[PDB]
Design an enzyme around this catalytic site. Sequence first.
Site, PDB file in Angstrom:
ATOM      1  N   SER A   1      37.502   4.956  42.332  1.00  0.00           N
ATOM      2  CA  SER A   1      36.319   4.504  41.598  1.00  0.00           C
ATOM      3  C   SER A   1      35.422   3.740  42.538  1.00  0.00           C
ATOM      4  O   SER A   1      35.787   3.362  43.639  1.00  0.00           O
ATOM      5  CB  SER A   1      36.735   3.653  40.404  1.00  0.00           C
ATOM      6  OG  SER A   1      37.199   2.374  40.811  1.00  0.00           O
TER       7      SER A   1
ATOM      8  N   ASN B   1      32.028  -0.837  37.267  1.00  0.00           N
ATOM      9  CA  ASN B   1      32.934   0.184  37.813  1.00  0.00           C
ATOM     10  C   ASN B   1      32.764   1.529  37.110  1.00  0.00           C
ATOM     11  O   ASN B   1      32.586   1.615  35.891  1.00  0.00           O
ATOM     12  CB  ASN B   1      34.379  -0.349  37.711  1.00  0.00           C
ATOM     13  CG  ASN B   1      35.418   0.538  38.314  1.00  0.00           C
ATOM     14  OD1 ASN B   1      36.008   1.354  37.650  1.00  0.00           O
ATOM     15  ND2 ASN B   1      35.605   0.384  39.576  1.00  0.00           N
TER      16      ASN B   1
ATOM     17  N   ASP C   1      41.888   3.641  43.615  1.00  0.00           N
ATOM     18  CA  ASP C   1      41.861   4.462  42.415  1.00  0.00           C
ATOM     19  C   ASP C   1      40.658   5.416  42.385  1.00  0.00           C
ATOM     20  O   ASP C   1      40.425   6.068  41.388  1.00  0.00           O
ATOM     21  CB  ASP C   1      41.904   3.724  41.069  1.00  0.00           C
ATOM     22  CG  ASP C   1      40.598   2.974  40.711  1.00  0.00           C
ATOM     23  OD1 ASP C   1      39.750   2.920  41.565  1.00  0.00           O
ATOM     24  OD2 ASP C   1      40.360   2.734  39.509  1.00  0.00           O
TER      25      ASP C   1
ATOM     26  N   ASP D   1      32.235   0.553  42.477  1.00  0.00           N
ATOM     27  CA  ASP D   1      31.529  -0.531  41.798  1.00  0.00           C
ATOM     28  C   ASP D   1      30.073  -0.510  42.214  1.00  0.00           C
ATOM     29  O   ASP D   1      29.772  -0.397  43.376  1.00  0.00           O
ATOM     30  CB  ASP D   1      32.132  -1.882  42.208  1.00  0.00           C
ATOM     31  CG  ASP D   1      33.589  -2.031  41.839  1.00  0.00           C
ATOM     32  OD1 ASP D   1      33.960  -1.547  40.772  1.00  0.00           O
ATOM     33  OD2 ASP D   1      34.288  -2.631  42.659  1.00  0.00           O
TER      34      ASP D   1
END
Length: 130
Positions: A51, A60, A49, A53
Amino acid sequence: KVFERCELARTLKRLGMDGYRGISLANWMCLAKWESGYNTRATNYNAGDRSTDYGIFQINSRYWCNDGKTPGAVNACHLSCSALLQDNIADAVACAKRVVRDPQGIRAWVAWRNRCQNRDVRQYVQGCGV
């Protein structure tokens, strides 16, 4: 930095995490252990997606911090994701507290559900003076 277990426990307690929104220190320790191995500098890209972390709690970028490169993301902690890569965890703790003001609480992190929920987590704080 990679914290030693009991140093992190006392660091978190001085930052107000023991019992924050009902969450014991041992639960926050279990979270940090399984998210990052107590490592503040870690980033993990999620190719699915787009993103990433960040840091000791692997927070996130889609909802919680801004990194500029996560499409359609928001920044509920109002921090650069860089702030979540510091050796000083004050900003990361402030953001973790923001996470758990939302309905799911600590369940927001799936690693906590997998590795901490409904388990005996007392070992994480044993001997640390907290």
